[PDB]
Structure formats: structure tokens, C-alpha cells
Design a protein around this ligand. Structure first.
Ligand SMILES: [Zn+2]
Ligand SMILES: [Zn+2]
Ligand SMILES: [Zn+2]
Ligand SMILES: [Zn+2]
Ligand SMILES: [Zn+2]
Lengths: 351, 87, 460, 66, 284, 344
């Protein structure tokens, strides 16, 4: 009995270039009380946490939000890479209470058009917050699902504590036949991990496709204060960035310059992808009988790691979760952080 | 009729007072599932009971290790275990 | 609290520079200097190059000079510097004793307290000699503050309670009751009780064998460096050793046995100087061992209690019975009124509840605070923090016990032209420095902070 | 830098009328009168202002609490 | 308002030894240590008993000095025990220095020690809920030639910046040696709001330490005094080595190159790009 | 008041009154009566005793009780023996009662099943968010002059007549009509209560009001929003139609005894099918301070919090001196009305 990653995520390809559009749902089903405040108020906040983390782990992507009220699919934020605008729309959604029922087919019709401006390199994905037990299809919903699979638009849905075949078929059909995106939620923590697992890339089997060699730029900082200006918003910007090509001022952000249309990234977009592409092997709990390490931690100083000859305390476990290749022991609290935010293994690096 | 395979699931609610006495007439596979704790429930509680059913059963709980006790994966656990059953 | 930093600024300049001569004392007073001054003190301590105030005005960012104004005013009030008007500017130079004192202490120096501590076999561990000091302090708490039993071994503690106003009871008869000085001292969480009573010990014994600077240097000496072996016996002057021996007998110092031994590391002086965890016949349970009672239903639910702790609570709540875990008491308008008749205004109990007796109010406030700092711009609905209903109950009751509201400040004049009164008033609203203003009478009753900064621009 | 220190006695006009009579009983210790709501008094005898106020409410009302 | 200053002073035979060769041999890293020691003493002095830590990095190993990791199983006298543990551990840490320490001259454990500091800070801040400490770490790097920009540890170093923003633990970088602006470190400070100070190695660091490394820990009320510009033109193309402003990112390979690659299967990944995809690139 | 919508039969359920005569000892079904009709000094004629005799020959199996506590229990045991009843049902209201004699009505009838959990019905939407208040109207000379001169109960209306109390009510008049709430005033007096709401110029409940007019006043009250203030007198209990309550104002604070207060507190504070405001059930106790009603009001202050309802104190209205109808605001005018109230 041990609950960790099985062997290792084989580092070959993961989806960093993406445009995931989550489709929320504000329906009278969400007026039914399942969560602590209600279905509607709670899910928004965990999507609010999802948005920042989604930008945190996939900063070269864009985000869009879709709501479903009164049997109609309604977008509140276009597919874009703006974290603050997405939250601002969700606040008004949070300010209001749900009514009606969700409309699956309209959202699927919305999803196809919405990700059409999404670039080829960005991996297509639409996230469905489907919680109710019925849809509203003004046509053949099997036709649009056939369009998304043919046009290579993978769909992962985040269902509530209910199981529907159409959503399961939708997940199976779009994701290259793979049926592994139908995890559902039953708790406050349970629904967040579905969002958190959507924050990370979702590889199952990458096919051989025509890969695109695309051109993107790196901006440069500014320092003027009294000459405060920017060519992106045309406001009193007391600090911003500049494209090396167009010389058109932009605020301090990864905002794409509106003059020559080349992608702008500072340091995070390349770096946040690098730790995603090649994950290390999980530091599994080294056996206490097979520890052969000193009574402390290695990455940090956690002297606690052995009860030693204390009945049901001794023969228990040990704070000695060691990395595989680096062969360095580490406490479970420490070794978890070793694979939580930054891999940065000490024994692996200290060589 | 509501269940098709092993994967199939769903609540089968029955609403009558005398169903308390007819626990004997229920089939043993169904009757075993009807413990003494499911007698004379409240339907709103049964709504909660199916609310919990909808919360628990709908989860994609596929441990794949507890399957083999009653799923007997392909041509492996049948030859391995049923030879012990020929006693 | 008697605000010793405002009392130490009243003592003349010669005795202030008397204290700065010890690098241990310079470090100890450095920890209590305001943080903006702390930056200024260390800055001028390192390079002793005279610089006009204009350049120092360039160093810092925008508004926030209120710390700067109070710091330099404090610096002059306690005369840690000497303002020298050379070129019409402020050539602020640190006091020669204070400037030189921090040189050693910051660079591993020989401060008389810092290096006077003797490293030896510290038989007095963290729990060594502190439990007796806490009990001796506990005894002086029952005698001075007023408790069921006054078992304090400090006879000078009781005497200082009467004449020095440490105990609000019959000083002549030897009793320690709760009075205006006692309520103010006990209202302070830690510093107010320690600072107010300690002043009586210094003020009373301050001329004959007292050694004002000598007793202070020894008190700063104990916090200057850990006494260890030969600490209390050694790191104590004629006034210090008598004070330390008096502290050893009176609970002021955690000395060893026989009234003459090494300084055991008691936590009482650490509590006064570092102002850190106040948790200490050999059982020392903390921190949440103590606790109090507060409720929206106007009923106290106590489950953890301490002997002296309930004595303070019962002074402002009706005491009926003590159980294994529960103490009977019902907080209402009547309950606070018990101490309100005695003249103790219901001001320091509000801070008392959220600072002490809260270890049993942890979960009750755990639904109060709700992390209303980052989400404060997001959500504006408080979850009852700080408690307004009990505040409404107390303020209504305290107002009844007074029926008159008195405000403190200083009246001003010379508002000849209407423009000057309005311009300061509007900015006063931004800072909340004006209690009330009127253009018709051109007079208001507030402190000097509004007056001082306007003249600062006028003068500079 | 001008400063004129003292104690301010302020309340609603009805209570203010009662208070001014109270201080008038001890040779009008009130230093100055700014207006109908604010009274500048020397902080020496303010405790006497409230103590005489305490007597008159107890002497007259006697707290019948009927 | 205590802060946790986790000292990470790297002693890399590749980087540390070359300091004697450049300029003149007028002293060792002892001032680099001792100015950091007293700055640790001064840091220990300003706040009310603010915990600290000292970590060093060989070229092929790491070890703590002040925290005094498990091996067995005057003035306030606390600055002594900080130094007493320091001088005792730094001796046995220096004692574990030989050819094996210098063996991995291509490798660098300074990234590991910086990783060690983040883990040590993370564990300390996790457990120390009482009296929360606004921790920050300071790394003094031996500015020396023959390794101006290494490429294999590029991934771990840029990831460390995230935690500094994530855990609110600013990384302070001081370059100690010749005028080689470490671009990864030149940008780590600005990205994590720390301090870059390519100070002269021999200069008594406390004057810089007390000025430019005293604002970040807990107060931050005043203008910091950084090094020169923080231009946002990132690393060079891996295939060629030329600094690029408008880069050419290949694919999920994520390597950003110049126009040098033939438009398919760059020498960083085995992915045959579409021929028409190269044609669009060649169309400009 | 309610039983018409109920499917029970009014013609068969002969309303026994002993003064108006209906059909008795002849009903084939259920009947509705009172304890006073059963056996008390309120035996207006021998008709009541004829019902009692028939209740023995007829084997009556169930008896529904409505507020037994007003009638002493001694008659309860006397009637039971002769009636030879099978089972009963005492639908009382008060936890503490005078009917705790040797024969407990609980064991006389049977074990209790459910308790009057008022915190459940005053928080679930009918009367949810009970904001009980006690208005301490600012004092003046004449109230202090009236307190010292006379301490008899004749003063009970000499502190009720406070013009600031009416103005404190007038804040609740303007605030709640602006909020679309319901305002209920409770005043056992008649003449001074009538003098109250003429000034604001609105229809209002008053002492010995014509019944058709008062329900017409109620017609504009809970159906219309322009008229929302109703001044219930002692004619309200017991008993009349207890109205839907959103803001209840009590002026009389003696109202002996405390057991009546628990019934009256539960009675007038009734279901309100409205949830726009966060506090959909206000309660206000307009009590003159430094007057006799200190003790009586402070009994209510402990009473509401002991009943479980949430409590507050409203002493500072939002702009008290700027509210309309500033009649009798000055201290001189208040004294003049106090002498007029001496007539009552
Ligand atoms: Zn802009
Ligand atoms: Zn551009
Ligand atoms: Zn490893
Ligand atoms: Zn660890
Ligand atoms: Zn590549």
C-alpha cells in the first residue's frame, strides 16, 4: 500500500502551448445545495484559484470563461491570457445567483467557434463545468462532437457528483478515443484537484502531427516616470515594456504588442514550461530496514526520522523519502515539496 | 432491468409500508443488499441516500486491485484461484 | 503603562549619556528605538560623517515621515543625539556616547552587560529558576495586583505597591487592592505591568545606594548578556547587586540559591526586554493552559483556568463558584460595572480580552478574523472583528458610569486668515488628527502633531 | 509654537448646562468657554466636576428603580 | 519582526579558486565569510532573536554550517554560538574538501545549495507558524572566468525564482569577482525583488550588506540600491549561441533558437517539423 | 380567522360560547369550544353544563387544548373523571405554567412529542433574523420631574407619552415603509395612543377601533406598502388575529404577568413571508429612560435573549433630529402632554 505516481511521467511531450476555456454553469441545479455556501458561489472561487494557477503553470496559454444560464451558453471573457479580467467577470457571476439549466450543445457550438482563433501550436481544450442532469440541445449534439474530434479539439469535462454518458462520450470522442477525463467531484477538496489536475498539462498519447516552427519575441524594460506613457493602452503608464521590433510601448506584462503581432514573454513562460516537460521520479519512502542513512534530512535539517525500538513506533515508517537517481534521503514533508513547486533535488544537483 | 452489467449501477427505490414485511420475498442477492438499516426510510432521507449514492457511485473509482476479487481479470485469476475452489 | 521612554526623556542629558557608555545598554535601547530611527541609528553609527538633513531627505520614499518626525523628536527628547545647526540645516550627529556605544555592541563588543555574563555550568535551565521567579512574580501579582493569597517574597514589592502606587489598596496597612494605578498596570498585557511597577523600584530607591544609572545599567546588563555563572552575583553594581539581591529575594532576578550565586536564566527579564513568549512545584504547563471567557450570548464558558488568572477575571465579572473546569460568571452591562464604580474605565479590558485570556478564545476568534487582509478589498463584510456588540455593551455601560466624555489635547490660536485653518483641517481629515474644527471660532483642542509638521515646513 | 493646555469638558447642551453649574460651585475653575459645547477647564478640579455630579444624581433620584 | 537569513555562500573550486588568480592574493573568502558572519550577527542583532542558517556548496557536494546538521547521531554569547557552530562546522566542512570536491568542476552544487536553502526555508516557515518570519536568502557567488554562463543547470536556477515569489523569500545575489554579470542571477533578483550587487570582492561587504541587503528582509520601506540594468533579453540560442530579441521557439521542445535550424528537427529534439511550417518561417 | 381555509367543518364544529346558541349534543362529528365553556365561572347558562353531561354519555376520544395555562388545571381533572375521555391533546405554548399542580397535564394526557422550539420558527423564514431592540428615548426634565414626584402605577402612561418615543417610532415608520417592511406598535392605552398617529396622518390601529376599519387598516397594512404602521392596543390579546410581524413596537412593558409576555411575544411576532432585508423581523421596545420602565424594560431585555431571539439596542436613529413631524420635540412641549396624560 503506497499512494504515489506509479513509475514516472516519461518526459517526451506535454501541452504547455494551449488555450483551455472553462465553461462554468449557473443553473437552478446549481441553486440546489451541495456545497457549503451553495453550488454556484463555491465553484467560482476554486476556478478563481484555478485561473491564477493555470497562468502560473501554463503562462504561454490563454483562458476563456463560459457560463450557462436559462438554457443558453454565454461567454463572460473571450479566450485571452488576462488573469485579472477573468476574475473580474467571475465576480459579477459570483454576485449573481443561478437560474435555469445548462445548455451543452450550445456550449459545444460555442467551443468550436471560440477556439477557432486559438493558434495551431496552442493545444485545444474546453473544460466543462457540467453538474446538472440534463442539457438543452437545439440540434444534433453528436454532429458537433464529430466536428471537434475531426478538427482535433480535445475536451475534458469536470462533472459534479453525477455521471452522464453524453459527457463521458464527449470526453472519449474528442480526446483521440481516450476515456480518462471523466473524473467527478464530491467534496470541497475533491473539486479543487480536478481544477488543479487541469492546471497541469494533460498528456495521454501525443500523435505525430505537422509541427509548426513559430516566431516569438522578448521585450525590454522601461524606467521613465514623468514621461509616463504606453502605446498599448494609451494611458498614464509609469512603467512598461517594449517590443524589440515595433518600438511600440506596452505595460509591464507579457502582453502581445499590437503593432507587429509577435508573442512576448519575459522569463516565466520558457521556465515554467521547462519544469513541466521533464519531471523527475517521485521521492518514494525509502524502507526503514533499507534506509542506511543518518537520523536527519539531507535537503533540509529534519532530525526526526526514527523512533528506534519503540514497539509500534519503531517499525512504522520514516521521514526518509529518497529520490531515485540522486540516492539522497529526505523527509516526507520536505521530499513532497521537492516535487511540489520546484523539482530542484539537492542530491541530484549537488554533484 | 435497471442494471445491465457489473459496471451498471443505480438506486431501486420501492415505496410501500408492507415492503418491511416482504424482505423475505426479495431475491437473496437483492435481499442481502437490503439490510435491517434500510427498513422504513424517509423518502427525503432516501433522497439523501440517493444523494450519497449519486455522490459515491458516480465517482470513477477504478482501483483495479480490488477488482480481481470479483472481476477476475483476463485468464489470470480464474486459473490461479478457481483451482483452489474445486475442493 | 507609564511610558518609560517618555519618562526616560525627562531625565537630564548627563545621565542619558551615562547610560550610553555601556555597549550592552546601547544595544538594549536600540531594540526599543522606532524602526525608522533604527535604520537612522545604524546608518549614523557606521559612518560618522556629518551630512545635512536635505540628503537624508533624499534617501527615503514619500509620505511616512511621521515615523521620522516622532523618531527625531524622541531622539532629542531622550537626547541620544545633539542637533547642531551648522549651515542652517540639521547636521544630525549621533550622541558621542550613543554613537560610540553601538560600535562595540554591533561589532561583537565588550558591553558591560554583554561581556559581563559568565559562561559556566548553567544548572538553571529554561525551566530552571524561572518557575520560582514566575511563582515569586505570581506571589507579587497576588500581593501587588490583588489576588486571593499574597505569597510574594518581595517585601519591598509590597511596600513599593503602597507608596509607589503599585497596589491600589491600603498602602499603610500593608494591603494591595485594585485601584487607578493597579487597573492601568494590570490592563497592560506584559509591558504595562512590568514597566509601571519597576519605575517605583527605581524612583523610590534612586538616591541612597540606588545608583540610578548603575541600577539601570545592571538591569540593562542582565539583558545585555546572559549572566550564566556568576551573573546575578557578578553582573550587579552597588545598586545593581542590591537591586539584583532585592530582585533575587523579590522575584525581580532569577538568582541561584543562598541570595548569592550565579544568574539563573529566568524568563522574567527576557519578557521585559525582548517582549516575547511570556510562558515560563515543578509543573510548568503552557501556553494555552491559561484562558478566559467571552461570548455573544453574554455568557462566559471557561474550561481551562489558572489560580491567579480567574482572580483578575472576577474583578470585572461576578464570581459565584469554581468547578473542575468551569467558573460561574455572566458577562453583561452589570458585569463590567463592578470595576466601573471603582473608577476603572472600561478601556484596557477591550485590549485585555484580545491579548490575554484569548488562549481559550482561539476558536471563537478563529471564526472572527477570517483573514480579512487580502480579501478586505474583495469582501467588505466583517465577521464580528473586533467584537462590536460587546464593545457596544461596554461603551454604553462605561458611558453611564461617567456620563461625561473628556478629550485630551492642546488648544491653539493665531488663525488670523481663514485659509490656514481650512487647509490644515482638510489634511487633518486625511490623517484624522483633528477631533473637531470650526472656522468661526478658529480654535481646536488636539495634540501638537498637526502644529509641529506645519511649522516644520515653515521652518524648513 | 503656541500651546494652551487644559481639560475639555464637552457633552450635549442639556448635560453641559448641569456641568457648568457644578463647576460654578467651586469658584468656577473652568479656565475658558469656547462655545456652547466645549469648555476649557484646568485638569486639577475636573475630578471634582464629576464627583459633585455623582452626589446630585444620588441625592435626588436615590435610585428607586421602581 | 524576525527574518530568516539562510546563508548560501558557495565555495566552488571552479569559481572560488580563480579569485586568487585574478587581481592579487591579498586575502581569502574569510571577509566574504566574516562580513557575512557579522552581517549574520548584525541580522541576528537587529531583530528579536531572528533565526538564521549557513549553507555552503562545493563543486561536488553541499553542507550546512550554522544549523549544525546531525553528525554525532562575548556579547550576548549568542553571536558566539552562531560562530562557534560556524567555525566548528566550516572547519569540518572545509575538511571535507579534496579532489572529489573539485572533481565535478563542470558540475555546480551552488544550484543545489540554493535549492537546499529554499527547502530549508520552506520547512522552517512551514513549522514556525508562531512568530512568522519574512525569510530571505543571500548568495555570494564567486565571479570567475571559464564559466560565465553554464547551460545544464539552467533549468533548476530559473525555477528557484518561482519559489522566492511563491514563498515570499527574496533571493539576494552578490557577485564576488570579476565583471561577469551573471544574467541568470542578474535577472533572478529583479524577478524575485531582491538585490543584485556585483560589488568588488575585496570591499568590506557589510557596507554593501547593511545598505543593500537590509531593506529586503522584513521592512522594505525605502529605495533599494541595485546593480546596473535588468534588460529583458534572455539567454542565447542554443544551436548558435547568439543573443536573440525576437526568438524562434521550435516546438514542445521549448528551445528558443535563431533562424539557424533547418526548420525541422532542431538539434534539441527529434521532431520533424512540417515543411510548410518552415516555408512560413522562410517567407519573411 | 384561519379555520375557513381549513377543511374542518364550521357548521358541524359548533363554536360553543354559552351566549350565542348553536347545535349541541347533536353533532355527528367534531366540535370546537373552550375551557371557559367547559367548566369555569364563565358558565353563562346551563347550556355549557348540558354539554358536560353529554360528554359522559358520549365516549369522547380526543380533546384539543388551546392555551390551557390561562385556565387553572383544577377544572381539567374535574371534567376528565365525569367525561370519561379516551385521549386528549394539550397544545399549550409556555414552558412554565401555573398548571403544574399534583396532576401534571403531561402525564394526564400523555408523553410529550415535540417542543415549541421558537428558535426554529423565528429563524427559518417566517420570522427569521429577529432583531429585538429596546429604544431608550432621551430623557428630559419632566420625566425626571415626574419620576421623583410620584412613583405609583398611575405614572405608567406618564412616561409612555414621550414625543421622542413617537419620533423614535417615526424613524421606524419612515425606515420600514421605505424598506417595504411591516411596522407593528403595541400600546395598552387608548387616548394617548390615538393622539399618536394623527400627527403623521395615516390610518392606525387604536383602542376600541371599529373592527371593519382596523382590518381595513390592516388591509392597507400587509397588502399595501404606503400604510405600514399599526398600533395594537390591549384589545389584541386575548384574542384577535395576530398579524404578520416585520417590525414590532412594544410601548407597555409591565403587561403582567411574565407568562402573558411569553405568549404575547410569541403571538404578535408572527410569520412574515418576505426576505428582502437581511433583518426581516425587527422588534423594538420604545422605553423612556431615567423613568419607571427601567425595571420593566430590563426584564424584557433578559427575556428576549433568554427566549433565544437575537438582541440589539437601538438608541441612535440615523438623523434623529432631522426626521419629519418634529412636533413636541422641544422639552417644554413634552411636559404639557404629560399633564394631559394625567387624565388617563
Ligand atoms: Zn498600457
Ligand atoms: Zn512588436
Ligand atoms: Zn534526487
Ligand atoms: Zn527535508
Ligand atoms: Zn526542439
Amino acid at each position: 500500500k503506497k499512494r504515489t505516481a506509479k513509475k514516472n511521467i516519461t518526459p517526451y511531450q506535454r501541452g504547455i502551448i494551449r488555450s483551455l476555456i472553462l465553461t462554468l454553469d449557473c443553473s437552478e441545479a446549481m441553486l440546489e445545495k451541495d456545497l457549503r455556501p451553495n453550488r454556484h458561489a463555491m465553484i467560482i472561487q476554486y476556478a478563481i484559484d484555478f485561473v491564477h494557477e493555470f497562468f502560473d503553470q501554463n503562462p504561454i496559454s490563454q483562458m476563456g470563461i463560459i457560463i450557462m444560464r436559462n438554457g443558453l451558453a454565454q461567454l463572460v471573457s473571450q479566450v485571452s491570457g488576462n488573469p485579472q479580467d477573468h476574475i473580474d467577470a467571475l465576480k459579477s457571476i459570483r454576485k449573481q445567483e443561478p437560474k435555469g439549466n445548462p445548455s451543452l450543445q450550445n456550449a459545444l457550438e460555442m467551443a468550436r467557434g471560440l477556439l477557432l482563433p486559438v493558434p495551431a501550436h496552442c493545444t485545444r481544450e474546453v473544460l466543462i463545468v457540467f453538474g446538472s442532469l440534463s442539457t438543452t440541445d437545439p440540434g444534433d449534439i453528436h454532429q458537433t462532437i464529430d466536428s471537434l474530434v475531426s478538427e482535433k479539439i480535445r475536451v475534458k469535462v469536470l462533472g459534479l457528483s453525477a455521471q452522464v454518458a453524453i459527457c463521458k462520450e464527449l470526453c472519449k470522442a474528442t480526446n483521440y478515443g481516450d476515456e480518462s477525463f471523466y473524473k467527478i467531484l464530491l467534496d470541497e477538496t475533491h473539486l479543487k484537484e480536478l481544477f488543479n489536475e487541469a492546471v497541469t498539462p494533460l498528456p495521454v498519447n501525443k500523435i505525430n502531427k505537422g509541427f509548426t516552427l513559430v516566431k516569438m519575441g522578448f521585450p525590454t524594460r522601461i524606467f521613465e516616470d514623468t514621461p509616463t506613457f504606453c502605446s498599448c493602452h494609451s494611458k498614464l503608464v509609469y512603467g512598461g515594456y517594449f517590443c524589440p521590433n515595433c518600438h511600440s510601448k506596452v505595460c509591464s506584462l507579457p502582453t502581445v504588442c499590437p503593432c507587429c503581432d509577435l508573442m512576448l514573454i519575459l522569463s516565466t513562460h520558457l521556465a515554467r514550461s521547462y519544469h513541466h516537460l521533464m519531471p523527475l521520479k517521485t521521492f518514494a519512502e525509502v524502507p526503514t530496514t533499507e534506509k542506511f542513512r543518518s537520523e536527519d534530512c539531507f535537503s533540509c535539517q529534519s532530525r526526526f526520522p526514527x523512533x528506534x525500538x519503540x514497539x509500534x513506533x519503531x517499525x512504522x515508517x520514516x521521514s526518509r523519502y529518497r529520490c531515485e537517481d540522486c540516492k539522497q534521503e529526505f523527509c516526507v514533508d520536505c521530499d513532497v515539496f521537492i516535487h511540489e513547486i520546484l523539482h530542484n533535488c539537492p542530491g541530484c544537483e549537488s554533484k | 432491468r435497471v442494471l445491465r452489467g457489473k459496471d451498471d449501477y443505480g438506486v431501486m427505490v420501492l415505496a410501500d409500508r408492507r415492503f418491511s414485511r416482504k424482505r423475505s420475498q426479495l431475491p437473496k442477492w437483492i435481499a442481502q443488499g437490503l439490510s435491517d438499516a434500510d427498513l422504513n426510510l424517509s423518502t427525503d432521507m432516501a433522497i439523501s441516500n440517493t444523494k450519497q449514492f449519486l455522490r459515491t457511485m458516480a465517482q470513477p473509482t477504478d482501483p483495479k486491485d480490488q477488482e480481481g476479487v470479483s472481476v477476475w481479470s483476463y485468464e489470470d485469476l480464474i486459473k490461479h484461484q478457481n483451482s483452489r475452489k474445486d475442493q | 503603562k507609564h511610558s518609560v521612554t517618555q519618562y526616560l526623556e525627562e531625565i537630564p542629558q548627563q545621565v542619558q549619556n551615562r547610560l550610553y557608555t555601556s555597549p550592552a545598554t546601547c544595544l538594549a535601547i536600540y531594540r526599543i528605538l522606532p524602526p525608522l530611527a533604527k535604520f537612522f541609528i545604524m546608518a549614523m553609527v557606521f559612518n560618522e560623517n556629518e551630512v545635512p538633513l536635505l540628503d537624508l531627505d533624499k534617501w527615503v520614499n514619500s509620505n511616512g515621515k511621521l515615523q521620522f518626525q516622532n523618531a527625531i523628536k524622541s531622539m532629542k527628547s531622550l537626547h541620544l543625539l545633539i542637533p547642531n545647526k551648522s549651515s542652517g540645516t540639521l547636521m544630525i550627529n549621533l550622541n558621542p556616547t550613543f554613537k560610540i556605544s553601538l560600535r562595540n555592541a554591533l561589532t561583537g563588543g565588550e558591553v558591560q552587560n554583554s561581556f559581563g555574563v559568565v559562561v559556566e555550568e548553567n544548572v538553571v535551565s529554561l525551566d530552571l529558576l524561572d518557575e520560582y521567579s514566575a511563582n515569586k512574580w505570581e506571589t507579587i501579582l497576588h500581593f501587588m495586583v490583588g489576588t486571593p493569597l499574597a505569597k510574594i517574597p518581595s517585601e519591598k514589592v509590597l511596600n513599593l505597591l503602597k507608596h509607589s502606587k503599585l497596589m491600589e489598596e491600603v498602602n499603610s496597612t500593608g494591603e494591595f487592592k485594585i485601584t487607578n494605578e493597579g487597573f492601568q498596570f494590570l490592563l497592560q498585557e506584559i509591558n504595562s505591568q512590568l514597566w509601571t511597577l519597576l519605575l517605583q523600584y527605581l524612583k523610590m530607591i534612586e538616591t541612597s545606594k540606588m545608583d540610578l544609572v548603575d541600577v539601570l545599567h545592571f538591569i540593562f546588563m542582565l539583558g545585555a548578556l546572559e549572566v550564566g555563572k556568576a551573573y546575578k552575583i557578578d553582573a550587579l553594581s552597588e545598586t545593581q547587586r542590591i537591586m539584583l539581591q532585592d530582585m533575587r529575594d523579590y522575584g525581580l532576578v532569577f538568582q541561584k540559591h543562598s541570595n548569592d550565586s550565579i544568574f539563573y536564566p529566568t524568563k522574567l527579564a527576557l519578557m521585559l526586554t525582548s517582549d516575547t513568549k511570556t510562558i515560563r512545584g515543578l509543573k510548568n504547563q503552557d501556553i494555552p493552559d491559561g484562558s478566559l471567557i467571552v461570548e455573544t450570548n453574554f455568557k462566559i464558558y471557561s474550561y481551562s483556568n489558572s489560580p491567579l488568572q480567574i482572580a483578575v477575571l472576577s474583578l470585572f465579572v461576578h464570581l459565584k463558584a469554581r468547578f473542575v473546569n468551569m467558573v460561574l460568571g455572566q458577562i453583561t452591562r452589570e458585569s463590567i460595572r463592578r470595576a466601573l464604580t471603582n473608577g476603572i474605565t472600561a478601556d484596557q479590558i477591550i485590549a485585555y480580552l484580545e491579548t490575554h485570556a484569548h488562549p481559550q478564545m482561539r476558536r471563537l476568534a478563529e471564526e472572527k478574523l477570517e483573514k480579512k487582509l487580502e480579501l478586505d478589498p474583495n469582501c467588505k463584510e466583517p465577521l464580528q472583528v473586533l467584537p462590536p456588540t460587546v464593545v457596544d455593551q461596554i461603551r454604553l455601560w462605561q458611558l453611564e458610569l461617567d456620563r461625561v466624555i473628556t478629550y485630551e489635547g492642546s488648544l491653539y490660536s493665531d488663525f488670523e486668515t481663514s485659509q490656514e485653518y481650512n487647509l490644515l483641517s482638510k489634511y487633518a481629515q486625511d490623517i484624522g488628527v483633528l477631533l473637531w474644527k470650526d472656522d468661526k471660532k478658529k480654535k481646536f483642542f488636539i495634540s501638537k502633531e498637526g502644529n509641529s509638521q506645519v511649522l516644520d515646513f515653515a521652518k524648513r | 509654537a503656541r500651546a494652551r493646555k487644559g481639560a475639555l469638558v464637552q457633552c450635549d447642551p442639556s448635560i453641559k448646562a448641569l456641568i457648568l453649574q457644578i463647576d460654578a460651585k467651586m469658584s468656577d475653575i473652568v479656565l475658558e468657554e469656547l462655545d456652547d459645547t466645549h469648555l476649557l477647564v484646568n485638569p486639577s478640579k475636573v475630578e471634582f466636576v464629576k464627583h459633585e455630579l455623582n452626589r446630585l444624581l444620588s441625592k435626588n433620584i436615590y435610585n428607586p428603580m421602581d | 519582526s524576525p527574518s530568516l537569513l539562510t546563508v548560501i555562500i558557495e565555495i566552488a573550486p571552479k569559481l572560488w579558486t580563480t579569485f586568487d588568480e585574478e587581481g592579487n592574493e591579498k586575502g581569502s573568502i574569510i571577509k566574504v565569510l566574516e562580513a557575512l558572519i557579522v552581517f549574520l550577527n548584525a541580522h541576528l542583532a537587529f531583530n528579536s532573536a531572528n533565526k538564521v542558517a549557513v549553507i555552503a556548496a562545493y563543486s561536488q557536494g553541499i553542507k550546512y554550517l550554522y544549523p549544525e546538521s546531525t553528525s554525532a547521531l562575548x556579547x550576548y554569547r549568542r553571536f558566539r554560538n552562531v560562530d562557534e557552530t560556524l567555525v566548528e562546522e566550516i572547519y569540518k566542512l572545509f575538511e571535507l574538501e579534496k579532489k572529489q570536491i573539485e572533481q565535478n568542476s563542470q558540475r555546480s552544487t551552488l544550484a543545489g545549495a540554493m535549492s537546499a536553502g529554499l527547502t530549508y526555508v520552506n520547512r522552517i516557515s512551514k513549522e514556525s507558524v508562531t512568530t512568522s518570519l519574512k525569510s530571505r536568502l543571500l548568495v555570494l557567488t564567486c565571479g570567475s572566468g571559464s564559466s560565465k554562463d553554464e547551460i545544464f543547470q539552467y533549468i533548476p536556477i530559473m525555477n528557484c525564482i518561482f519559489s522566492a515569489t511563491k514563498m515570499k523569500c527574496p533571493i539576494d545575489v552578490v557577485k564576488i569577482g570579476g565583471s561577469k554579470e551573471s544574467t541568470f542571477l542578474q535577472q533572478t533578483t529583479d524577478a524575485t525583488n531582491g538585490v543584485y550587487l556585483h560589488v568588488e570582492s575585496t570591499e568590506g561587504l557589510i557596507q554593501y550588506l547593511a545598505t543593500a541587503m537590509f531593506i529586503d528582509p522584513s521592512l522594505r520601506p525605502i529605495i533599494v540600491k541595485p546593480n546596473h540594468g535588468s534588460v529583458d533579453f534572455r539567454t542565447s540560442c542554443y544551436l548558435t549561441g547568439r543573443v536573440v530579441a525576437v526568438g524562434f521557439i521550435c516546438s514542445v521542445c521549448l528551445c528558443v533558437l535563431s533562424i539557424i535550424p533547418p526548420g525541422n528537427k532542431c538539434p534539441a529534439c527529434d521532431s520533424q517539423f512540417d515543411e510548410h511550417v518552415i516555408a512560413k518561417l522562410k517567407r519573411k | 380567522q384561519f379555520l375557513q381555509w381549513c377543511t374542518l367543518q364550521p357548521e358541524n364544529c359548533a363554536v360553543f360560547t354559552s351566549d350565542n346558541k348553536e347545535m349541541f349534543q347533536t353533532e355527528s362529528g367534531l366540535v370546537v369550544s373552550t375551557y371557559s365553556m367547559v367548566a369555569n365561572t364563565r358558565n353563562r347558562s346551563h347550556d355549557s353544563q348540558k354539554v358536560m353531561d353529554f360528554l359522559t354519555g358520549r365516549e369522547w376520544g380526543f380533546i384539543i387544548l388551546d392555551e390551557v395555562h390561562v385556565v387553572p388545571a383544577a377544572m381539567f381533572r374535574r371534567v376528565v373523571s365525569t367525561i370519561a375521555a379516551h385521549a386528549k391533546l394539550g397544545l399549550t405554548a409556555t414552558l412554565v405554567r401555573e398548571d403544574d399542580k399534583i396532576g401534571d397535564l403531561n402525564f394526564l394526557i400523555g408523553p410529550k412529542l415535540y417542543e415549541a422550539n421558537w428558535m426554529e420558527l423565528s429563524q427559518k423564514g417566517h420570522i427569521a433574523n429577529v432583531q429585538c431592540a429596546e429604544v431608550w428615548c432621551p430623557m428630559t426634565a419632566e420625566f425626571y420631574q415626574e419620576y421623583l414626584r410620584e412613583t405609583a402605577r398611575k405614572r405608567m402612561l406618564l412616561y409612555i407619552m414621550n414625543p421622542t418615543k413617537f419620533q423614535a417610532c417615526q424613524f421606524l415608520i419612515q425606515y420600514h415603509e421605505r424598506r417595504g417592511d411591516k411596522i407593528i406598535v403595541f400600546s395598552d392605552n387608548v387616548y394617548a395612543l390615538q393622539e399618536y398617529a394623527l400627527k403623521m396622518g395615516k390610518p392606525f390601529i387604536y383602542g376600541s377601533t371599529p373592527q371593519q376599519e382596523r382590518m381595513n387598516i390592516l388591509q392597507n397594512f400587509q397588502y399595501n406598502d404606503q400604510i405600514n404602521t399599526i398600533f395594537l392596543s390591549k384589545v389584541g390579546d386575548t384574542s384577535i388575529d395576530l398579524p404578520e410581524a416585520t417590525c414590532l413596537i412594544q410601548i407597555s412593558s409591565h403587561y403582567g404577568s411574565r407568562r402573558q409576555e411569553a405568549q404575547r411575544l410569541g403571538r404578535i411576532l408572527r410569520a412574515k413571508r418576505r426576505n428582502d432585508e437581511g433583518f426581516n423581523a425587527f422588534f423594538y421596545s420604545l422605553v423612556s429612560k431615567d423613568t419607571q420602565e427601567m425595571y420593566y424594560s430590563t426584564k424584557r431585555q433578559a427575556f428576549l435573549v433568554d427566549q433565544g431571539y437575537a438582541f440589539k439596542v437601538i438608541t441612535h436613529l440615523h438623523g434623529m433630529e432631522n426626521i419629519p413631524n418634529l412636533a413636541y420635540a422641544s422639552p417644554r412641549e413634552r411636559r404639557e402632554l404629560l399633564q394631559e396624560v394625567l387624565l388617563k
